[PDB]
């Protein structure tokens, strides 16, 4: 099948940036969403240059909106976790100051 | 503040399960097996998770029903912590019109 | 980019089924879902068997969920319409016995 | 009764706009670009969409002030059928931080 989800909420802790034997970037980070009619962390993960973007503009109580694919792993007493597609910082409450980076293709 | 709202296709691994509440509120309790595809290299279809979901309500017993293992569902809803453990709080539920077919009932009679 | 949408509503009229030249399949029908705090219609279509499988088993007036993708045409005096992903029948207010059909890769 | 809410990715074609109502609401318009990939045959990237999208209150301000022209944002919200014309009843918008950086302020000064 297939399962893509969105979420708003803000940042528990700074986005935690490690790099890959590779090389490719790994961000990593956990938004707190509390519903409206509680209380639910979802831990997300970000991969080349988005990740490196997200640890160096994002830090703990930013709003943020975040889309991605659920994903789980087993852990030692499995946990759902999430793929991030594209995220951002919510206007909502907040204003930014964008600087794009050209190169298109790569 | 922020919400949290989700869309899952995927299979039952077993018949709904109707766990009426002290209250006498009806829930039915399954969960969606969802193997997504990844069009990469050429594994080119896998990575399998489960979500466990609780359904509501009137729907809870249409669910325990109509469904049964195996069946391929459209689940619409959000993920609360309640209850490790985070699940499907169920808003609607249908069977996939894809690879099969269904009759309806409805709402007012037998 | 992207964009998906998943809508649940009740049907306007019953799926208008059509096949192509090529002799794919192709239904058709348009969803009307109105908001609780209105009225909207987007028409939807669908492709390959799981079009016939709309057609024989939904009529007008039924509660759906779809999921799919947005698209848009031109028309002369641009409409948003949905590419159907994946569609079934809500059981929020109805039963449904469902027969699948064996074959799986095809 | 059934909803109906939506994600986009893509970009806004144009610097936002202030539309203040009759009764004193701002009301930021814009409208966002979005052509999906498609990976088939080896076209596969293209069938661009444009998506007119309306966000109220406060955000409407801050999305005035922040986003620009060609910026790549991500939203969230739903398609209302006021107002041809369906357009995207913004809930929440972002700058999508992929292929870019932003500096965020807050709720509470200057």
Not at 24 to 52: D, G, H, K, M, Y
């Amino acid at each position: 099948g297939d399962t893509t989800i969105t979420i708003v909420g803000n940042l528990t802790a700074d986005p935690e940036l490690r790099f890959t034997p590779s090389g490719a970037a790994v961000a990593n980070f956990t938004v707190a969403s509390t519903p409206r009619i509680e209380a639910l962390f979802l831990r997300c993960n970000i991969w080349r240059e988005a990740a490196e973007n997200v640890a160096e503009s994002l830090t703990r109580g930013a709003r943020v909106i975040v889309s991605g694919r659920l994903k789980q792993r087993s852990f030692e007493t499995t946990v759902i976790e999430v793929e991030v597609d594209e995220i951002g910082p919510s206007l909502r409450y907040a204003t930014a100051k964008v600087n794009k980076a050209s190169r298109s293709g790569g």
